[PDB]
Design a protein around this ligand. Structure first.
Ligand SMILES: *[C@@H]1O[C@H](CO)[C@@H](O[C@@H]2O[C@H](CO)[C@@H](O)[C@H](O)[C@H]2NC(C)=O)[C@H](O)[C@H]1NC(C)=O
Ligand SMILES: *[C@@H]1O[C@H](CO)[C@@H](O[C@@H]2O[C@H](CO)[C@@H](O)[C@H](O)[C@H]2NC(C)=O)[C@H](O)[C@H]1NC(C)=O
Ligand SMILES: *[C@@H]1O[C@H](CO)[C@@H](O[C@@H]2O[C@H](CO)[C@@H](O)[C@H](O)[C@H]2NC(C)=O)[C@H](O)[C@H]1NC(C)=O
Ligand SMILES: *[C@@H]1O[C@H](CO)[C@@H](O[C@@H]2O[C@H](CO)[C@@H](O)[C@H](O)[C@H]2NC(C)=O)[C@H](O)[C@H]1NC(C)=O
Ligand SMILES: *[C@@H]1O[C@H](CO)[C@@H](O[C@@H]2O[C@H](CO)[C@@H](O)[C@H](O)[C@H]2NC(C)=O)[C@H](O)[C@H]1NC(C)=O
Lengths: 346, 346, 346, 346, 346
């Protein structure tokens, strides 16, 4: 017989197969085994708190109404246009904001029925999945994106999802991200839902993303530190050259301001304080204080010999005090942002 | 009987069920009970005056044409492909700008018919809902987004919507927003429409959003205040050092200008005046006035002893007068923007 | 009879109703009465020269093939899935760039057939409509957006559109725009098309939009004016302090430049000259000329007593001449842009 | 007979009309006459090298299988839902990147069959058409956008396209563009394709666009020229005032830099050199050279009377030499960009 | 016979053709020959790591069930609406993120059946294909975009893809890119997939893109070099003029900062270090070090004849040492970025 006419006999009207009735309709629940292959991963966006993925989803279950022994071939293949003639699980992605299937050329779907009634069902689809991001430690933040597979209308006494044991989630080689770095280790969890209706099956996977810091180091942190160092050279300039020390102080404040305002187009638009904002505020307070120090030296120095040496003492104290307090701030900043804040205990 | 063939008998041609006729067609109106579960909430945009939501919508009503007692099961389940065989309310979202259903895997829909004829109908859908925003008190503004559920073509003697009594609107845990903060308290109101055609049912929910201020404090308000303070140190510099006091005055004006123009890429594009614009204008008038004060001191001081002390008196008066009037402005600014303007009386 | 089976008798095959034949097929033209209710209005974009609207469109006409007297109910309701069984006008929006209907929940459509054969047809739809904008007087410009309703394939001896007499165009309360302000008065016009094929019916509505000026006043015009005033204080500084007057002149030019370049991210991207560009160019010519005045004073003053007083005379003349010519420019600018240019004569 | 039942007799099963067979199937090719009416024109984008159009497309040909004489009416009208019952040319736009039809209200389509068998077929559609743009002479560039109408699967012995003789391409009145200006003169060409399969018909139209220069003149070219002029006033300042001439030179370089970097957000993002980039680089080399001239004057002047006058001679030579070489550069720049480069020889 | 009725006899129910069974169902695999014609190429985006293409795809294979000799014509043409009546390969693009067909006018598809049973199948489609980009050598980077054609559900003993021998991949003339330059040479490779299911056929093509450097040379590298040169003229200024050398040093640092921050809006947003970032950091370290040199000269020079000449020696050494070390840096920079890094060995 042609492999198709055998399918029309297996899921036939004379056979009485009903695609709206689950396998083992009265007995134990259906056990669906799931795989994910991630083809692409990106478009991670803080404005919408989501990311975009392109996956192969494979589901495997057993349907005893589809067992056959008379046909010699040990596997049959359903046409993708006849997919509504067979029962399929009602899997949906719980944190999905948008999805579509792929129909370029032939529909990107595949269904294979085995001799014992096992069904293999593999589809290709694009997802936009939501992920809440924190950003409090922004240059040095670690994010966790999840992906939850849930049944829409079957409780856990009719339908149960499980991950594959060998490789349930795989990622294609050679994927890059402009901002993040996808780690190799992934969690497979149960996130079983308890509602008023009953207990609904749900499995999830967690991906860990670490932001790279090299660009922010070379473009924001180090230029701000050089501007802070440049504000300290006023303390070695002679206190009589007021146009020199005042113009150096205020141009250092202006350079600090153009550095902040120019860095303001390439940062995430949030409303709370980030760690780079703390750094940029302390560097501005440092260049503001170096100009107030000269305002005090210039005012104390003109009160007409005891007054000349008190003003020179303010300069010699500021020569050691400004770099020391800036080293203490750097120690507490990098310690509390690279040791005292790790959120991957999972 | 298979649960499906029983459905084909209940809504059968021999039964004479008509999906275009409401339940209790001659008698009292249909009472629909509604729930909302908000899965995601975001994309709040001032350019388009809208926000994006992803919800579960559940409707419950009674259809006496669907009551059955012969079948043992106390609940039946309609296939999502047979949903046009049953009557459903014509609910629409009155402030919707765009919407779609979810068909990833199986259609994200569910209909359950009980023994007494009660119908439970649960769908998943994405909305873009309009919300007019004010922005007059922008760093410190509070917004209210609503969501109106209305019948399209039935008056209130045929169809009535009501919220559930226990939990009509719930929000998923762990949702974050980049700019706002969704409050926990929600209003459930009637917004019944009165038209020429008659009285149309309509229920709504109000969400309250408060903008976070910490980033605007650390990046806009405090640097402007430091620049204003830096403009006051001219009054303690000797009045003979004209290149020092003129260059400090005009570089303080330039720093104020680069601070404003750099803050100009991360603010909402509206055409009216915001509170941050008031603050930025007053700080510019303060650094403009400190340079006019030196122009007066420098001009009065050269008129050739009575003229030297009048110019020194302008400096000693400005030393107390500029910080005092700036403290008075700060008191009236933060009082009228954090006490005299609350719009959540609802 | 069930209200549906009566519809299947009225537009029946035995009745011989043909949905492809207009009412009064041989006689006088069909008269369609139109209403518009505007739910939302926004997304006004100069880059694409269009705006976005969300309306209810209601059409009313008479079909004598649909008159019935045997049924007791004085109004019937066609199902939105049976809308291709009835004749409808082929209304299209002549300046539409994009459109779609709304199918969230049930299709957002409604058709009501009365006893005398009158049809009421109400649909909800989203439009993107084109509008050419001028922008020559940009901070102070007034725009006119139109909306044209035309028949696609019927001449004015078959189909005629008319506005309702009581309220053909209404707008929902509480709509805001980020940049514009929609006026209350609307024009209802005929814009009848004359083609080679014949005379085609077409009605239109005009909306008037006025841009708000308060933000541009507080952020662009007033800071530029303060910078121009700051360039005049060089004339009161002693002519011997060349580092003071040269540094004040060139830093005033730099402040004028950072003010222009920072305002350059929030303006519409056109290729012709706007009124704000005229203002920004004249303020730059004013701060350029104040520095050329000192270059002349400094050069004339050193030619070695007659030369000292000629240079002092240039300063005393510039003290009155620069503010006077700037007041004359302000008078001609605001007069020709707020009196001599009104384009709402309509 | 009803005009429809006559259509069902003309294209009937008893008539044996086949919509998959072209008219004159064995004989001479079909001659299709084409018109274009452009409703809107815009969204010209250098990032994607495309533009957007909204047109009416009208095709006219003769089908002798559709000739009829028994019916009194000299024109019939096919319903837009029955359009697959008739043969139509397989016209496609060869440089299209995206297209869609308009289905707001009734489908925006129209087909009219005459007595002699002539068919008039008019549709409304939106196109995104590709256009390669050059941008080497960017402020002063002229672009040419084309629009090619080709048959997909018929060689020129089956199907031939021709433009109408009276008005094949018309544009609606009152269209504006933010950046360009659409000229009135249009080319109608043949662009016949020669492939391995055979000779395929193809007609095209060329539109000419000229960029407006007024905004770039008032905002980029003239401020740069004023900054260059301001760098020349150092040559008239006394050579002993080193803080004045050094601060004026470096602040002029900084003003030139903020002028360039602020103009950097409103220019097209390409990777090759534009004419404005040439202008901005030469103006920077001019303000760089004026500061090197003072570095030479200041160094030569202190070598301890012969040295004082050699340094004064460098100043007096630079007073005439810098404006002269800048006038020569302006003459060669505007001559080679407004005379020696015209690309509309077509 | 009409060419259609012959098709209905060839793929007839009496013929028993089954479109779900491949040709040579029991025997050797089907050999499909593929061509690509690229109509447009662009939208290369680093944020999403993808590019957009518009191609003609042509597939050729042999179907012995479609051989016919009775008909005189040596080629038949299937209607695009009957394409599901014939077997077609299940080609899909393995790195596709989005795709669609073109249905403007008639569907842009074509199928031709020859006498011996050869099938030619040509479709037009738009692709968004993923490409990982590196950007470590960003101004001077070379990218490689691929395009993989794979069978979805057939192993290599049923279906085999091959490129054409004469011209499998062609590109239309006159395509331009805003940033890149598409090379003429293309690789044709096998990328055969080995899975658990078996061996799946897959062919690919590689395109090579080189970024143009002229704009980055004239706008970023050369202005930074002029600012570095301007920082060296302090060494030729007299060491007693402290306001001149301090103001020149700090204004050179500020100019370097506005140059970097203004270049910060037109660069790709990645998180790692690019070569332009290395260049911009070294130029900032050079202008920072020239100001530290004067801070040392000014401090050493005032310690009260031995001290005057040690400070003059620091100036005379810095006059030769700063340009030399900057020439060494330029030599190592351009050598390691234009010789030691070529990645087109392929
Ligand atoms: C799906 O898997 C579950 C769990 O593995 C199966 O439930 C078990 O079935 C065995 C039958 O041998 C019982 O002994 C266990 O007590 C069951 N466990 C639970 C928790 O119910 C279930 O039978 C499987 N379904 C099918 C159709 O095979
Ligand atoms: C829907 O709810 C309304 C209001 O609860 C019901 O209307 C009431 O019906 C009771 C019947 O016992 C009357 O006594 C009341 O006077 C009615 N109130 C009003 C305001 O009409 C209505 O019957 C319900 N519909 C159905 C189908 O049960
Ligand atoms: C549609 O309206 C037009 C104009 O009101 C009607 O045309 C008029 O019909 C009356 C019939 O009493 C004539 O006396 C007028 O001379 C007509 N005017 C014109 C300009 O033709 C038309 O009859 C209406 N159509 C229908 C179906 O009622
Ligand atoms: C379509 O137009 C072409 C060209 O005008 C016609 O081809 C000509 O037909 C006339 C018949 O009187 C011949 O004398 C010419 O020699 C033909 N020219 C060419 C170049 O073939 C063609 O007949 C037209 N098609 C139809 C159906 O009328
Ligand atoms: C498709 O091409 C393959 C390879 O060219 C063909 O396989 C060969 O068939 C010949 C038959 O003459 C054998 O001699 C070779 O040994 C085969 N090679 C391999 C690697 O199998 C195959 O026959 C072709 N398919 C069809 C339908 O013609």
């Amino acid at each position: 017989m042609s492999p198709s006419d055998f399918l029309d006999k297996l899921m036939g009207r004379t056979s009485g197969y009903d695609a709206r009735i689950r396998p083992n309709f009265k007995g134990p629940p259906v056990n669906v085994t799931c795989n994910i292959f991630i083809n692409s991963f990106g478009s991670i966006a803080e404005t919408t708190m989501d990311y975009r993925v392109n996956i192969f989803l494979r589901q495997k279950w057993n349907d005893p109404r589809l067992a056959y022994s008379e046909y010699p071939d040990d596997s049959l293949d359903l046409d993708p246009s006849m997919l509504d003639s067979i029962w399929k699980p009602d899997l949906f992605f719980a944190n999905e904001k948008g999805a579509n299937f792929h129909e370029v050329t032939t529909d990107n779907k595949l269904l294979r029925i085995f001799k014992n009634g096992n069904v293999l069902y593999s589809i290709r689809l694009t997802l936009t999945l939501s992920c809440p991001m924190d950003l409090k430690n922004f240059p040095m933040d670690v994010q966790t994106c999840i992906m939850q597979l849930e049944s829409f209308g079957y409780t856990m006494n009719d339908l149960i999802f499980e991950w594959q044991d060998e490789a349930p989630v795989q990622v294609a080689e050679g994927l890059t991200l402009p901002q993040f770095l996808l780690k190799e280790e992934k969690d497979l969890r149960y996130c079983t839902k308890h509602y008023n209706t009953g207990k609904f099956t749900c499995i999830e996977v967690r991906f860990h993303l670490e932001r790279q810091m090299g660009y922010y180091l070379i473009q924001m942190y180090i230029p701000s530190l050089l501007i802070v160092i440049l504000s300290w050279v006023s303390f070695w300039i002679n206190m009589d050259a007021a146009p020199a020390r005042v113009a150096l102080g205020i141009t250092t404040v202006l350079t600090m301001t153009t550095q902040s305002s120019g860095s303001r187009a390439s940062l995430p638009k949030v409303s709370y304080v980030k760690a780079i904002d703390i750094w940029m505020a302390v560097c501005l307070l440092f260049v503001f204080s170096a100009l107030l120090e000269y305002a005090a030296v210039n005012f104390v120095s003109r009160q007409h010999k005891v007054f000349i040496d008190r003003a020179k003492k303010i300069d010699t104290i500021s020569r050691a005090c400004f770099p020391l307090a800036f080293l203490i701030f750097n120690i507490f900043y990098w310690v509390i942002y690279k040791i005292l804040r790790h959120e991957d205990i999972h």
